[PDB]
Structures are given as C-alpha cells and as structure tokens.
C-alpha cells in the first residue's frame, strides 16, 4: 500500500527541499551537473561558454532524462569537485528533476581541507547535512568519498569522518574507487572499523572492473555495488589518448552485462546503476565534454533508453529493472535513525 | 593615471603609504563561503579584519595590496567590505599561488593568460572588481605548470601594464629562474617584484637581481618563531630569524644603493585556513600589531639606524605608486 502514498511519509533532502520517498521515483545515483573545482564556475564561467549556456545545456539534458523516465538524480559532486548547489537548484527547478546534493571530499581537496583533522572534517560534513551548504539552506543527502588505490593517510581521515557523519545523521555514503585495484575492500574495512552498516555504503565505479569475485564478495557482505559509468567508453576514439585514458576501452555492453551477472548470482538487491555523466567538465582536458557528448548524446538518459532495453532483451524482467532503478535507490537514500 | 582597487579606480596620489604584500584571509577557493565557521563566522572575520585594518590606518597605512589569488581563497567581496569599513584602499590580485585545483592545473598557457586577463580587464567573478596586480609562485625549481603561470603572468602584464609580484623560496634563489622566464617573454624587470626576499640572508643574490632592475619584496618582516621553539609547525612556517634580522636587510639594500627598488610589507593575515588550525592565533600572539607592524615598529627601527624620513617615504609611498601604476 505505502508504495503508492505521495502526500505523507518519511523524507529525503533535495536542492528544492524535502521530498517523500515515493516522490523520488526512478533515480540515477551517481551523476554530476558540472564536474569542476571549488569556486571555478564562479571565477571563470566563460570556460563553459557562459553560466547561462551551462544552465540551458543542463536543463535540456535533464528534460531528456525525465522524458525517458528519470525523476531524481544524485549529484555526487563535492566541495572540491566544484559543486555549486545554486546551479543545481536552478536546473532542478527548470527541468522538474529532483537533485540530491552531496557533501564529503573527492580527489582534489585544497590545502584548507588537506590540513584538517578527522574531527574537523566530521564537523564540516555535518554542517553541510544538518545546517546547509554555504548560505543556501540546501542540505546534503549523501556523503561522497574517494580513493585511487591504497588510501592516503588523509583519505583514511575522510573515510572515517564520512562514517561518523553518516552514523550521526543517517544519510548514506557513496565512494569513488580505482576498481581494478579492489579499493572497495580497504574502504569496507575502514567503514566497518567505524561501525558503519554496509547497507548504507555504495562502492562506486565498480563497473570499471571485470572481477566478479571482487564485486560479489562485497555484495555478499551487504555493500551496495555502484555500476555507475555504463556509457563510459572510448571505443572508436582510440586515436584520442586523453579520452581513452578517462573512459577506458571496455564497451558499454561489457559494463552493462555486469548488471546482469550480479542479478544472475543473486545480488539484485545490492545493485545501483547510473551514468556518471556531466553537463560541464573543467577538471580534465579542455575538449573533454564535447568528446563525451559525441560518444553519448543521450547523456543521463542512457540508462533508461539504452541499458534497460538491452537487459530486457537479455531476459531480465522489467520488475527487476524497476527494483534496481526505483526501489533500491529509495532504500539507499532514505535516512536511517541517527545514532544514540 | 589610475590603479584599480576593490572600491574602483583611484589616482596614483591617493594610494599613499602602501603595504605591497598582504592578505585579508589566506584560504582556498570556495572555502570561506562553504565553511565560515572555521573562522568563527564570516561576521567575526569581517570584524577582525576591520579592526586590524583600522589599526593599520591609524598608523599611517592608506593602501594594502592583497596578493591572495583564486587558489589562496581570495573573496573579493570580503576585500570590498573590509576596505570600505576601514577606509583603506585594497588592490586585488589575479594569478595563481601554490595550490591550484585541477581545473587550473590542466589549463594551457593561452587559457591561463585569458583567465588572468579576464580578472584584470573585465572583473573578478561577477563583482566588476578588477585586479591591479598578478601574483605567481615557485617553491624551488618551477614545476611545468608553474612555468606556464609565469609566462601567462608576463603575457597578461604586457597586455595590461599591471605588475607581477612573486612568491619565492628565497634560499633557493627562485627569483633568478623567475627572472629568466619573465625576460624570455619580454617582460621588463621594473614590472616585477621578487617577493619573500627577506627569507634569505644572501645579500649577493638580492643585489644581483636589483642590479638587473627587479624590485625586491622584503615582505614578511614580522614572521618569526623566536620564543615558539617548542612549536614545530609555527617554526617551520615562520622561521627562526628575527624580525630585526629581516628589517636589517632593508637597511642593507638602502646602503647598497637600491632604495628605489625596495618594497616592504608584513605578509600578515586576519584569517588563515590553509595551514594548521591554530596558526592565526599563534601568529597574532607574537605580532598583535598585525599589518601595523611595518609603520609602528620597522619605521622607528630604521630611523634609529639613521635612515632619513625622505628615504622611508620613498620606499613606502613613491615605490609602490610607481610599481602599481600600469605600464
Ligand atoms: C567529476 C567526475 C568525477 C568522476 O565521476 O569521474 C568523472 C570523470 C565523470 O568526473
Ligand atoms: C596566504 C599566505 C601566503 C604566503 O604569503 O605565505 C603565508 C604563510 C604568509 O600565507
Ligand atoms: Zn569518481
Ligand atoms: Zn562521478
Ligand atoms: Zn607567499
Ligand atoms: Zn603572502
């Protein structure tokens, strides 16, 4: 019954305010409006043509995803990935797509973050969840963290501060991994040393690897497996070294078949899927957004328009695909009880 | 004729006594807006900076050059607010310091030139406030990216006439490599201040650069960890040379004939988030005068050493105006 109930119930924070869990609907759990650096969009909007050009590009892209069935995206851009929550709020309103904003730290923290203690980082993450981001009043609904191989000492602090903020607020944790180095195992160990429940943790970029034994072992422990970069592929772009380095040479079909493999091995309930797409991208080489758009014009609509029909023909029932894209994110994003 | 400040353009005669290397807040891009509670609050930081700039003003300072770049967390709206409430001109900076994020580190020399030009010719962010100086940095041998920033700074200076000021590891003679790269771009040494030059005691390094026409930034005079020897982080940042030792380098360059090329400052701040947490309180505990340290302590020290008032006015008024005046 309660799955049909919109006008009451528990709540997820978005850039437009709280929404009920049922309103979230089809949710992409790892996306970006703009992948940048802190303060960069405000200091140099001409890098993106203009701020207005970026807004208009993002609103059209979100409308394309919405027409394909998407109702919510989780923007896992942190402070140091140049998250501008005022941009998210504007494009969410214009496109009528819910956007959940993130706290945490990604792979480019400035000195003012790198020098902080685990206690200080915990207060910063709590601030963005409990008080709001900057002076906007918009509260983060997820905590994003990152490793790229064996964790640095600072990255361990970030992982611990994220676990502590999650336990205190109930909001979930989502991670960036170097999947081929099995980063999720060390992340899991640190999270579990802090008492964090695996069901509150998504081990991301897990479709970057073909090692099913690594993925199923994490899923068997209750971790969520983020198969979040399905359209990332430089096939056909072999003469472009920067695009090949970033997007890899594994096909989207290979990445998507990992979704079916986890389903076949009984781990449907542990799967989250996404595109890891963006509408602006300044933290890499200059032409990269144009290159990515030439590869995947569907943008964030790639999961519903391409991946779902591909898995359907492979025999995955629609109800299973709806469970992965609607129910699984709703359980992930719904805050748990605060500790104490 | 005019110098751009955070309150708009001013004429050369309005600059007056000018501190040429200062910071309202040493931070990181976006950090003040995202975590103002690190500084107590934004309002507390404003109040502290206004009290400090008002004390400097009462001591005779009329202008400071805030050499905080994008990646040092420059918030030009903060600079404008504090400048207005203390009635002290503030010149803002473009360029890049020692902590550029990926979106900067990945850019070409042409792209960086366009960014520096934007902040000088158009304005910083959406504020309409234009930079009046370009800040660059090395810490020993330049990284490949730092070479790009030095060349972009030279190109922006040549296009606009605004000067370049540098951060050095002075004991590694970084000014020599900076000079080499600048001159390979056709930049005049008279448009360049080699900063943190009081961090070294090698007079021959400084005089050779000044004999080539460079300006010499003796800009961290009150930086000293004397009395803080049990504090490893303060000692590493501030050094164990006394302020008197740093100030005597001013007199030495005067005595060697370079008074027209000396620029003096405090390199002080009112907030400081890019280092260890307690550092601003520690620094304030050894120099309560803050930015007033140059007029209240260094000036009398040099006057007792026999430096005439006309020479000290030349260094603190004439030189900064000549340096900041475009082209
Ligand atoms: C800012 C984001 C982070 C991660 O999702 O990688 C990509 C390349 C998509 O950039
Ligand atoms: C932000 C400023 C930059 C440079 O002047 O170093 C100090 C330590 C004084 O911090
Ligand atoms: Zn990532
Ligand atoms: Zn991402
Ligand atoms: Zn410096
Ligand atoms: Zn400085």
Curated annotation (Swiss-Prot), chain A:
Residues that, per the record, bind Zn(2+) 1: 30, 32, 144, 276
Practical use: Has attracted interest because of its potential use in the detoxification of chemical waste and warfare agents and its ability to degrade agricultural pesticides such as parathion.
Cofactor: binding details: Binds 2 Zn(2+) ions per subunit.
Modified residues (N6-carboxylysine): 144
Binding site for Zn(2+) 2: 144, 176, 205
A biological process term (GO) from this entry: catabolic process
Keyword Zinc tagged: yes
The protein's Enzyme Commission number: 3.1.8.1
Cellular component GO terms, alphabetical: plasma membrane
GO molecular function terms listed in the Swiss-Prot or TrEMBL record: aryldialkylphosphatase activity; zinc ion binding
A UniProt-annotated Pfam family: PTE
Function summary: Has an unusual substrate specificity for synthetic organophosphate triesters and phosphorofluoridates. All of the phosphate triesters found to be substrates are synthetic compounds. The identity of any naturally occurring substrate for the enzyme is unknown. Has no detectable activity with phosphate monoesters or diesters and no activity as an esterase or protease. It catalyzes the hydrolysis of the insecticide paraoxon at a rate approaching the diffusion limit and thus appears to be optimally evolved for utilizing this synthetic substrate.
Subunit relationships: Homodimer.
Protein family according to the UniProt entry: Belongs to the metallo-dependent hydrolases superfamily. Phosphotriesterase family.
Protein known as: Parathion hydrolase
Protein source organism: Brevundimonas diminuta
């Amino acid at each position: 019954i309660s799955e049909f109930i919109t006008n009451s119930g528990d709540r997820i924070n978005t850039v437009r305010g709280p929404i009920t869990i049922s309103e979230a609907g089809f949710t992409l759990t790892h996306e970006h409006i703009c992948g940048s650096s802190a303060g960069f969009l405000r200091a140099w909007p001409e890098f993106f043509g203009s701020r207005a050009a970026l807004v208009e590009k993002a609103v059209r892209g979100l409308r394309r995803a919405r027409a394909a069935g998407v109702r919510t995206i989780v923007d896992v851009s942190t402070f140091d990935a140049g998250r501008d929550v005022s941009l998210l709020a504007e494009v969410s309103r214009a496109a009528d797509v819910h956007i959940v904003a993130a706290t945490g730290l990604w792979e480019d923290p400035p000195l003012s973050m790198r020098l902080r203690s685990v206690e200080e980082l915990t207060q910063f993450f709590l601030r963005e969840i409990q008080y709001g981001i900057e002076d906007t009043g918009i509260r983060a609904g997820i905590i994003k963290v990152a490793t790229q191989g064996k964790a640095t000492p600072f990255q361990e602090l970030v992982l611990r501060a994220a676990a502590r903020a999650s336990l205190a607020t109930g909001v979930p944790v989502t991670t960036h991994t170097f999947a081929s180095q099995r980063d999720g195992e060390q992340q899991a160990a640190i999270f579990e040393s802090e008492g964090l429940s695996p069901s509150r943790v998504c081990i991301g970029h897990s479709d970057d690897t073909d090692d099913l034994s690594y993925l199923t072992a994490l899923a068997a422990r209750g971790y969520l497996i983020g198969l979040d970069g399905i359209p990332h592929s430089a096939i056909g772009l072999e003469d472009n070294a920067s695009a090949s380095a970033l997007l890899g040479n594994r096909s989207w079909q290979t990445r998507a078949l990992l979704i079916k493999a986890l389903i076949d091995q009984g781990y449907m309930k542990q799967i989250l899927v996404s595109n890891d797409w963006l509408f602006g991208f300044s933290s890499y080489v200059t032409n990269i957004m144009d290159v990515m758009d030439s590869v995947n014009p569907d943008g964030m609509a790639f999961i519903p328009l391409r991946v779902i029909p591909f898995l359907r023909e492979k025999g995955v029932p629609q109800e299973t695909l709806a469970g992965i894209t609607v129910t699984n994110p709703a359980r992930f994003l719904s805050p748990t009880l605060r500790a104490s």
